[PDB]
């Protein structure tokens, strides 16, 4: 069922710098694509991002459900929402349809604020199609192309890293993973968030 | 799983294996030995204990009236004369109702044992589905009891002593453990009498 | 995705280079065109081992026939032999898909052969997952009496667009040219990456949208 | 041939100094009935080789006739002690038989161990062989010993300790924790008894009435069966 | 996955590995199977990790509410009852087998929960793919009324035996000690290529400074 | 079965679909009108699948969008129309499925001329061009080949003529008659083609 | 109702150079979720300048390797010269396709050095298709290591580039790859044998990996 | 799938069939020649079904009939040809089935101009007229309506033109191109039609 | 179907039920009691009788050597000293071979009984598939023998008399008939000794 609209997402961490990336394919009947702009990354808060991989309708439906819940939370509390709270709420939503579930394997990527000045701690985690959370503290990968990404990251991860080197690392890992999957690819985007700014870049991938 | 129950003189005995505590204390004068699926049996054991506490509270009158190792425990009854302890026919028949209404899922053969003032020592056999039969001689259930059916038929007497039934039920469960493959561990035995109940286990 | 069509200066044959075990590609470079004879080629599709083994077996039998009779075989005879032997293994699990093309005494000839003994003669064929896209682009822009340069450009673009909407197809393009005195390899292997960023996205600014 | 009916439990084989030690419970279970509690599950082909068994009994019996009569044919064309076939020969033979039956799809529902001594420089038993009817032990190098395994699918290997059945979780763990090299007979028998005790306490299909066989310079020694101490 | 539990001298010790699998591959190398129910009750289990996480959070917060309402120390039998009703109501499809342990007013007592809603108090148990490898050496070495150090060493005997043996289990070994007063959670108990700048190609870039 | 084609560029949009009412092995008609659904305002919905499913879904979506526009006294945005159709299709997919493809198109002041692909499992995304049915295989690569930026409506109609010629020549159902629906310069023009 | 197919599991890594070929493989045998032994070499030497590795069913690879060695020895006996690696590759292709309808559960890699001192590497499927390569991997971990080899050898999606490669760096890269596979896959192994072939014969070393 | 039509009357016989080489959802060609099988003498065999089955069966039957005629130095009778084809088809049906329809036709001195229907299960019988495929439904009643005794070849071709127009207009596969095979006055004339 | 075989002193006994003549005479010193499918068992009984006649003819030496109702029949052996009667190990093992080579179809548990000079009274149990075990104490097969497994284990002695084994096997089959549902009719019993075989049936 995940061969229908195959996709992949990825996210790494570094020294006061975090990265998230995805492929831009939308499939139909497995072996014929229809679009090269379907971004699996969705901005949700000023320092929280979420990567949804799986069936496209379930990706979109889960995006609107989470956007509803999020914007409700910032409007009532009148303050910015935390990554852990969003992760727990996402796990509850995926569990709430434990039977007949959303066929989506999401991830969460963002920053953790520790007020005292303020320190931005990286945060990354991944989920099954039910909400099997597992904190990882380094590279997090999820999708049909997950095995190739797991293979690439350990060879290419260098612990904490500069944001430029992080972009090179995550870009090479994603491009080498997507080239070895037939139903995943067709371009890529790499979002590198920092406290000062976010850099969004698209890669000259084997989109063909 | 092997399950055996025998009526002897002024009392009643029960037995099991320990392989997967199969005897469960619903009440002081009322014990039940479980066979079949563990989860199904434990759920209905929780529910029947709930119902027993309900009727035991409900049937209470208002005012004053009546003015190897054989490691064993003894528990004398708190209620003398069986004033408010429920009847084993009642608990067995509501158990029959519960299994019958949910017989599509519930698959567990239960055998009941207790003492009542009205009808003395009793032994009720709840089968698969909602079938209940009062056994005046003996009751059997589980895979391991299949092999000792003729042994019990041969060596049973009408009015047996406590020691006779002790040795007979112990050798019965030992032979079932020896023959049957899915039964083992220490043997548990419970003797229920007019005025007390004594729990004793055998490690052989 | 295989390809073959007939024109003034013979026959042009084009193939991809991908190879899939399902959702995962085994190898990005392969060779789907075998020199069955000095004057005959044959594309390859479907089950890789089946088609490879059976064109090599057919090449063996062709060497037997030519060496005995001392006469070059026709494409019709090789296609008939292939369709006969593949029909013997009907209902067994073979998925051979073949386009046989070459020059013989009759002239330039082309045949399509399948696992079900489907011998069909023609002048334009394509087998694979991306067969429909190549058929569409050729029949939009295929003509007789066009030059060889236009023919290789057309075949390369058709293979490109077949790879564009087919994950199964990809890798590199290998366009061969068959003429009277054998054949020549116009494009031994050329990456589809620079092909895309020449054809559809000549300017390397912003992701291409479709 | 179509499925297991009467099943044995498990066997353990370990090599030590002076030979190897192989043990098995004498019981064959008819499902959940335990019909037979005295069955010979460890067999002998010749001196310096034995055959293990954990599975369907008919297939083990058929393999027993094949292996022992292959030894008969070996004796009938024997002129010197070195001409006797080694455990590697028989292990390869059983592996080929299992592979052929797999390819035909008519398997044997068994998991065989072949083990013994693949050398002749330690005893002169095979120069004058004694099939019907029948000193100090000589230490044997582990390289000259051999223990093998054969799966339903024909999978095979060799190691210093091999177990089948449920012993591949319990007893294999105890061996990987505690197995040393060149342990005496007492330590090896203690380890085997501990593993079989753990199996008896957590395996229905097993039992305590254990058979123990040794393969040393003196030859195959079927000791008296014993009930485990527990 | 490998889980274990043990009853000791006026205490309970749980143990588990730190690895989770998504098929023949490994996702997390330092996972946390041990989970906090109460200050004197802990748990760990094997199955679908989403079911384990949700059911454990539900049990944790329900126990917290029950403690706040009653103002009495939480009890392990209550947690067993809630879990057994929860798994029995949902027909056993929530495959989550849990090793429950705690120290209530009736002394230490370990429990083993199964998918279908059955339960059984035991002195020791193990669950998961690598259960048998661990619990063999447990029953080989288990004794009544140990010291706490002997219990922790035996727990590393079980979980380190299962890590070395079972393929579905691995990584670090977790230990948690539960007591009538206080607890201890030893998370790491035992623990047995840069590219140049501009290497990758791009075709778009857009910097958005954050307010 | 039912071929739908769609193309979008600067200052035009084109939709197209065969005109055939299939029942078993025959045609009820060669001039079907059950596939296109004109919406009030510069909007349209082209459906493909079983006749009853597209009838119920298209009428339901059209008349609810009309209800929104009459109650609110404003023209619904095209993006809202597309995502509302997707949400309705996904909801009905989970309970009472509608095996029906979609091609949402329209014009908006804020977004301009735009098109949306959508599958029978509500697999929706914006595209410049797309197709549905078995004929999507034999016309989509043509649309890749001859589409370029700053296109015109006449060039688009030439591309559609090429696609119709290909569907007549090579596709198993040699579809002859088609109906088009052009949106450009705040007009909605319909054409009928027979190659 | 008996399925004659089990994935014992493993991985075999291969890499080439100008005048050498490096092939590496595990030394673990296993079942679904349990391990038989910690030492079971899957690489079988065929000739003086050729070896074969495999992954899948242990019995099938043993039978295939011993059968191929039988055919090679008969070839040397009949024809009085050792067969080339291309000859062995075509022979193994014909052997695999003979059992087309009951195929071997064996994903093979055939390494060696041609007569012109060129390190070749052929990679196979279960049925018989084969193609020369400069890098390949098979088995359970094939999806893990194959992108890494594509990054290192082919080195596409890069601009600065570096083709300066030698024997020691290639060996160290193979050690890094098999270690990463051992960390990131459960069937991989605990000890691995790095076979290296050169014009001056064959050398074999051993390396110790994680035991989990 | 593959439409075959046949008509027989006094002093003529006509066969007809679509010219289409279907593979999956496309056409390999629009000018197929694998359906008709000319036999030496005034005989023919028209087959319909999968391409390989009709190729093997038609070549086998044709070349065996040629073998009979060369060995015996006489023209095989049409009835013998039809029943021999039926027996071969039935024998292969019991062991290695050939999913292929048939329409045997020819001319004989003793029986005259005659035609034989035959199904894929060798359900054979003489008829004045018949058809095969899904198109047999949409053309057989026309053939009942406009057939009469003492017909001519031109009237028959008009009937076939009506059937082709019906198959283009109403049948799901709107078949345009057809190939005919007329037997009359000891000649075998072939025609190609595009309605 | 219930099938029981017991070794006692200087002899061996067999028993069956009569419900669907289960004991079959292969030879004078060799009787076999059949359990399982009727057709499969009767086919292999015809084949094993054929094989017994074959080896009984074949092993003959050349020249001269050795210069309720308990209605019963006695058949003294014609061959004294067991000169040419085949061995029960041989007939049982070829029976094992026949069932093993056709175990995909053949489903029948047979228990053999006879006297041999080499090994005296013997009792071989051919199971489902080709599994053969020599039982020195007793052998059981059929559905009705499942219930008397512990009874036989309890009341068996090492060196039993003819009357002891008679009463034990008769009560065994009677209890199996009483418990088991698919066994009944008159009981047939066959006693095989060193020098004679006596067939007697019980109608109770
Ligand atoms: C064009 O459309 C294009 N599509 C693909 C690439 C799609 O796979 C293919 O069909 C390709 C043929 C091919 C590949 C390599 C090669 F050297 C020659 C060749 F002709 N098809 C495939 O590779 C098989 C997919 C398949 C299709 C139909 C079937 F009925 C079954 C399978 N895949 C393989 O052959 C694969 C293993 C295999 O044999 N399988 C799948 C388990 C069937 C038993 N073998 C390889 O990929 C190469 C060997 C391994 C290298 C490490 O070609 C054209 C049509």
TrEMBL record, chain A:
Q: Name one GO biological process term.
A: ubiquitin-dependent protein catabolic process
Protein origin, superkingdom: Eukaryota
The keyword Hydrolase appears for this protein: yes
Q: Where in the cell is it found?
A: Cytoplasm; Nucleus
* InterPro entries documented for this protein: Ntn_hydrolases_N, Proteasome_beta_3, Proteasome_bsu_CS, Proteasome_sua/b, Proteasome_suB-type
Keywords of this protein's UniProt record, alphabetized? Cytoplasm, Hydrolase, Nucleus, Proteasome
Which N-terminal stretch is annotated as signal sequence? none
Q: Which GO terms describe its cellular component?
A: cytosol; nucleus; proteasome core complex; proteasome core complex, beta-subunit complex
Question: Which parts pass through the membrane?
Answer: none
Any one GO MF term held by the record is: endopeptidase activity
Q: Name one Pfam family in it.
A: Proteasome
Cysteine disulfide links: 153-173
Q: How is this protein organized at the quaternary level?
A: Component of the proteasome complex.
State the family it belongs to: Belongs to the peptidase T1B family.
Q: What does this protein do?
A: Component of the proteasome, a multicatalytic proteinase complex which is characterized by its ability to cleave peptides with Arg, Phe, Tyr, Leu, and Glu adjacent to the leaving group at neutral or slightly basic pH. The proteasome has an ATP-dependent proteolytic activity.
Mind telling me what this protein is named? Proteasome subunit beta
Query: Which species does the entry assign this protein to?
Result: Plasmodium falciparum (isolate 3D7)
Higher taxonomy:
Eukaryota, Sar, Alveolata, Apicomplexa, Aconoidasida
From TrEMBL, chains B, I:
The answer to keyword Cytoplasm applying to this record is: yes
What keyword terms does UniProt attach to this protein? Cytoplasm, Hydrolase, Protease
One MF annotation (Gene Ontology) recorded for this entry:
peptidase activity
**InterPro entries according to UniProt:** Ntn_hydrolases_N, Proteasome_sua/b, Proteasome_suB-type
Which regions span the lipid bilayer?
none
Taxonomically, the superkingdom here is Eukaryota
What name has this protein been given in UniProt?
A: Proteasome endopeptidase complex
Output the lineage of the source organism.
Eukaryota, Sar, Alveolata, Apicomplexa, Aconoidasida
From TrEMBL, chain C:
Q: Which UniProt keywords apply?
A: Cytoplasm, Hydrolase, Nucleus, Protease, Proteasome, Threonine protease, Zymogen
Chief subcellular location = cytoplasm
Q: Which residues cross the membrane?
A: none
| GO CC annotations, alphabetized | cytoplasm; nucleus; proteasome core complex
Task: Please give the Gene Ontology molecular function terms for this protein.
Answer: threonine-type endopeptidase activity
Is-annotated flag, keyword Amino-acid biosynthesis? no
Reaction catalysed?
A: Cleavage of peptide bonds with very broad specificity
Give GO BP annotations, semicolon-separated. Answer: proteolysis involved in protein catabolic process
Taxonomy, superkingdom: Eukaryota
- Span of the signal peptide: none
Q: Where does the record say this protein resides?
A: Cytoplasm; Nucleus
- Family membership, please give it: Belongs to the peptidase T1B family.
Assembly, per entry:
Component of the proteasome complex.
Chain's role: Component of the proteasome, a multicatalytic proteinase complex which is characterized by its ability to cleave peptides with Arg, Phe, Tyr, Leu, and Glu adjacent to the leaving group at neutral or slightly basic pH. The proteasome has an ATP-dependent proteolytic activity.
Give the protein name, as stated in the record: Proteasome subunit beta
TrEMBL record, chains F, H:
Subunit: Component of the proteasome complex.
Native species: Plasmodium falciparum (isolate 3D7)
The entry's family comment says:
Belongs to the peptidase T1B family.
The alphabetical list of record keywords is: Cytoplasm, Hydrolase, Nucleus, Proteasome
State the name under which the record lists this protein: Proteasome subunit beta
Any idea where this protein resides?
Cytoplasm; Nucleus
The function of this protein is: Component of the proteasome, a multicatalytic proteinase complex which is characterized by its ability to cleave peptides with Arg, Phe, Tyr, Leu, and Glu adjacent to the leaving group at neutral or slightly basic pH. The proteasome has an ATP-dependent proteolytic activity.
Gene Ontology MF terms: endopeptidase activity
- Do you know which InterPro entries this protein is assigned to? Ntn_hydrolases_N, Proteasome_alpha, Proteasome_beta2, Proteasome_bsu_CS, Proteasome_sua/b
Gene Ontology annotations for the cellular component aspect, listed alphabetically: cytosol; nucleus; proteasome core complex; proteasome core complex, beta-subunit complex
The main location class comes to cytoplasm
What's the domain of life for this entry?
Eukaryota
Tell me the GO BP annotations in alphabetical order.
Answer: proteasome-mediated ubiquitin-dependent protein catabolic process; ubiquitin-dependent protein catabolic process
* CDD domains the UniProt entry points to: proteasome_beta_type_2 (cd03758)
């Amino acid at each position: 069922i995940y061969n229908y609209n195959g996709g992949c997402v990825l996210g790494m961490s570094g020294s006061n710098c975090v990265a998230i990336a995805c492929d831009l394919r939308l499939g139909a009947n497995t072996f014929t694509t229809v679009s090269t702009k379907f971004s699996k990354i969705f901005k949700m808060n000023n320092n929280v991002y979420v990567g949804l991989s799986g069936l496209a309708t379930d990706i979109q439906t889960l995006y609107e459900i989470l956007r509803y819940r999020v914007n409700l939370y910032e409007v009532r509390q009148d303050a910015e929402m935390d990554v852990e709270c969003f992760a727990n709420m996402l796990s509850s939503i995926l569990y709430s349809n434990r039977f007949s579930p959303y066929f989506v394997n999401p991830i969460v990527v963002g920053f953790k604020l520790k007020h005292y000045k303020v320190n931005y701690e990286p945060y990354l985690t991944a989920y099954d199609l039910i909400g099997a959370k597992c904190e990882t503290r380094d590279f997090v990968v999820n999708g049909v192309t997950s095995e190739q990404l797991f293979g690439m990251c350990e060879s290419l991860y260098v612990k904490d890293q500069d944001e430029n080197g992080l972009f090179e690392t995550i870009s090479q890992c994603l491009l080498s993973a997507l080239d070895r999957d037939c139903i995943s690819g067709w371009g890529a985007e790499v979002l590198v968030l920092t406290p000062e700014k976010i850099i969004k870049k698209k890669l000259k991938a084997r989109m063909d | 799983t092997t399950i055996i129950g025998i009526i002897y003189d002024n009392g009643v005995m029960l037995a099991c294996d320990s392989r997967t505590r199969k005897i469960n204390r619903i009440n002081e004068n009322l014990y039940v030995c479980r066979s079949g699926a563990s989860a199904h049996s434990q759920k209905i054991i929780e529910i029947i204990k709930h119902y027993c506490v309900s009727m035991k509270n409900e049937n209470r009158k208002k005012g004053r009236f009546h003015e190897n190792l054989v490691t064993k425990n003894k528990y004398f009854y708190e209620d003398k004369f069986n004033d408010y302890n429920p009847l084993v026919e009642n608990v067995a028949h509501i158990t029959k109702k519960i299994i019958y209404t949910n017989n599509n899922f519930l698959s567990c053969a239960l055998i009941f044992g207790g003492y009542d003032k009205i009808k003395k020592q009793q032994l009720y056999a709840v089968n698969l589905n909602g079938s209940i039969i009062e056994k005046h001689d003996f009751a059997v259930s589980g895979s391991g009891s299949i092999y000792i059916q003729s042994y019990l038929q041969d060596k049973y007497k009408k009015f047996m002593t406590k020691k006779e039934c002790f040795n007979l039920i112990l050798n019965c469960v030992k032979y079932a453990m020896h023959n049957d493959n899915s039964s083992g561990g220490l043997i548990r035995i419970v003797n229920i009498t007019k005025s007390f109940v004594e729990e004793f286990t055998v490690v052989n | 995705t295989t390809l073959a069509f007939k024109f003034k200066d013979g026959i042009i044959v084009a193939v991809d280079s991908r190879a899939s075990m399902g959702s995962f590609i085994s190898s990005q470079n392969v060779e789907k065109i075998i020199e069955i004879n000095k004057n005959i080629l044959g594309t390859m599709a479907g089950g890789a081992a089946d088609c490879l083994y059976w064109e090599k077996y057919l090449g063996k039998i062709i060497k037997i026939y030519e060496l005995r009779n001392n006469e070059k075989i026709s494409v019709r005879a090789a296609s008939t032999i292939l369709s006969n032997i593949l029909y013997q293994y009907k209902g067994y699990g073979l998925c051979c898909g073949i386009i046989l093309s070459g020059y013989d005494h009759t002239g330039f000839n082309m045949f399509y052969v399948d696992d079900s003994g489907k011998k069909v003669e023609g002048n334009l064929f394509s087998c694979g997952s991306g067969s429909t896209y190549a058929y569409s682009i050729l029949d939009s822009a295929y003509d007789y009496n066009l030059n060889l340069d236009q023919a290789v450009e057309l075949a390369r673009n058709a293979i490109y667009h077949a790879t564009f909407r087919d994950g199964g197809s990809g890798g590199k393009v290998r366009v061969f040219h068959i003429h009277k005195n054998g054949y020549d390899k116009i494009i031994e292997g050329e990456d589809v990456f620079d092909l895309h960023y020449h054809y559809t996205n000549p300017e390397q600014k912003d992701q291409y949208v479709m | 041939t179509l499925g297991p009916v009467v099943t044995g439990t498990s066997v353990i084989a370990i090599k030590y100094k002076h030979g190897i030690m192989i043990a098995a419970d004498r019981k064959a279970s008819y499902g959940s009935y335990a019909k037979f509690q005295n069955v010979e599950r460890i067999f002998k082909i010749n001196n310096k080789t034995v055959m293990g068994f954990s599975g369907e009994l008919a297939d083990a019996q058929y393999l027993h006739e094949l292996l022992t009569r292959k030894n008969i044919n070996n004796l009938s064309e024997k002129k010197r002690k070195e001409d006797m076939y080694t455990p590697q020969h028989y292990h390869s033979y059983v592996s080929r038989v299992f592979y052929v039956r797999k390819n035909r799809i008519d398997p044997l529902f068994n998991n065989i161990i072949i083990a013994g001594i693949n050398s002749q420089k330690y005893d002169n038993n095979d120069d004058n062989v004694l099939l019907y009817t029948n000193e100090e032990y000589k230490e044997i190098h582990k390289d000259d010993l051999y223990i093998g395994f054969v799966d339903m699918h024909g999978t095979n290997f060799c190691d210093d300790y091999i177990t089948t059945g449920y012993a591949r979780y319990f007893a294999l763990t105890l061996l990987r924790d505690h197995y040393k090299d060149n342990m005496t007979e007492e330590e090896a028998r203690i380890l085997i008894n501990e593993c079989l005790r753990i199996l008896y306490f957590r395996d229905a299909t097993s039992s305590n009435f254990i058979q123990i066989v040794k393969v040393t310079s003196k030859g195959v020694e079927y000791e008296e069966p014993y009930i485990l101490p527990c | 996955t490998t889980i274990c539990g043990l009853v000791c001298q006026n205490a309970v010790i749980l143990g588990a590995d730190t690895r989770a699998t998504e098929g023949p591959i490994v996702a997390d190398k330092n996972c946390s199977k041990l989970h906090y129910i109460s200050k004197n009750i802990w748990c760990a289990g094997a199955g679908v990790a989403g079911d384990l996480e949700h059911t454990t959070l539900w049990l944790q917060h329900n126990v917290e509410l029950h403690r706040l309402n009653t103002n009495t120390q939480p009890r392990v039998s209550m947690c067993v009852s809630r879990l057994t009703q929860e798994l029995f109501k949902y027909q056993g499809y929530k495959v989550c087998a849990i090793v429950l342990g705690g120290v209530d007013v009736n002394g230490p007592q370990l429990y083993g929960i199964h998918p279908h809603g059955s339960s059984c108090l035991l002195p020791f148990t193990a669950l998961g793919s690598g259960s048998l490898n661990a619990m063999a050496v447990l029953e080989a070495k288990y004794r009544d009324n140990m010291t706490i150090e002997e219990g922790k060493n035996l727990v590393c005997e079980a979980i380190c035996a299962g890590i070395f043996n079972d393929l579905g289990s691995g990584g670090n070994v977790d230990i948690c000690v539960i007591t009538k007063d206080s607890y201890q959670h030893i998370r790491p108990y035992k623990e047995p290529t840069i590219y140049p700048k501009g290497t990758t190609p791009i075709l778009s870039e857009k910097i958005e400074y954050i307010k | 079965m039912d071929t739908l084609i769609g193309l979008r560029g600067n200052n035009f949009v084109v939709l197209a679909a065969d005109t055939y009412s299939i029942n078993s092995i025959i045609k009820l008609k060669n001039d079907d009108n059950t596939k296109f659904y004109d919406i009030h305002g510069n909007k349209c919905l082209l459906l493909g699948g079983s006749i009853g499913d597209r009838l119920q879904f298209g009428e339901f979506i059209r008349k609810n969008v009309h209800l929104y526009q009459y109650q609110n006294n404003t023209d619904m945005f095209v993006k809202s129309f597309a995502f509302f159709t997707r949400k309705n299709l996904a909801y009905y997919l989970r309970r009472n499925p509608f095996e029906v493809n979609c091609l949402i198109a329209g014009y908006d002041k804020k977004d301009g001329y735009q098109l949306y692909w959508c599958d029978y499992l509500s697999n929706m995304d914006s595209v410049n061009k797309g197709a549905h049915g078995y004929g999507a295989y034999l016309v989509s690569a043509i649309l890749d080949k001859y589409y370029h930026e700053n296109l015109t409506v006449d060039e688009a109609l030439d591309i559609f003529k090429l696609c119709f010629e290909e569907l007549k020549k090579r596709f198993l159902l040699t579809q002859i008659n088609y109906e088009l629906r052009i949106m450009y310069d705040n007009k909605v023009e319909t054409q009928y083609v027979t190659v | 109702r008996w399925y004659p197919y089990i994935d014992n599991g493993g991985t075999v890594i291969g890499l080439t150079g100008k005048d050498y070929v490096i092939l590496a493989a595990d030394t673990r045998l296993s079942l679904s979720y349990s391990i038989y032994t910690r030492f079971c070499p899957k690489i079988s030497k065929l000739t003086d300048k050729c070896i074969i590795g495999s992954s899948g069913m242990q019995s099938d690879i043993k039978t295939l390797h011993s059968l191929l060695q039988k055919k090679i020895q008969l070839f040397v006996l009949e024809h009085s010269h050792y067969p080339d690696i291309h000859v062995i590759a075509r022979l193994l292709c014909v052997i695999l396709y003979s059992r087309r309808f009951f195929p071997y559960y064996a994903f093979n890699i055939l390494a060696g050095v041609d007569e012109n001192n060129k390190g070749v590497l052929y990679n196979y499927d279960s049925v018989g298709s084969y193609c020369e390569a400069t890098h390949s991997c098979v088995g359970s971990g094939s999806q893990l290591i194959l992108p890494i080899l594509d990054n290192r050898v082919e080195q596409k999606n890069q601009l600065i580039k570096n083709t300066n490669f030698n024997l020691g760096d290639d060996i160290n890269f193979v050690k890094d790859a098999i270690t990463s596979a051992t960390e990131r896959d459960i069937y991989t192994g605990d000890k691995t044998l790095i076979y290296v072939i050169d014009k001056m014969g064959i050398n074999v070393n051993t390396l110790d990996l994680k035991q989990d």
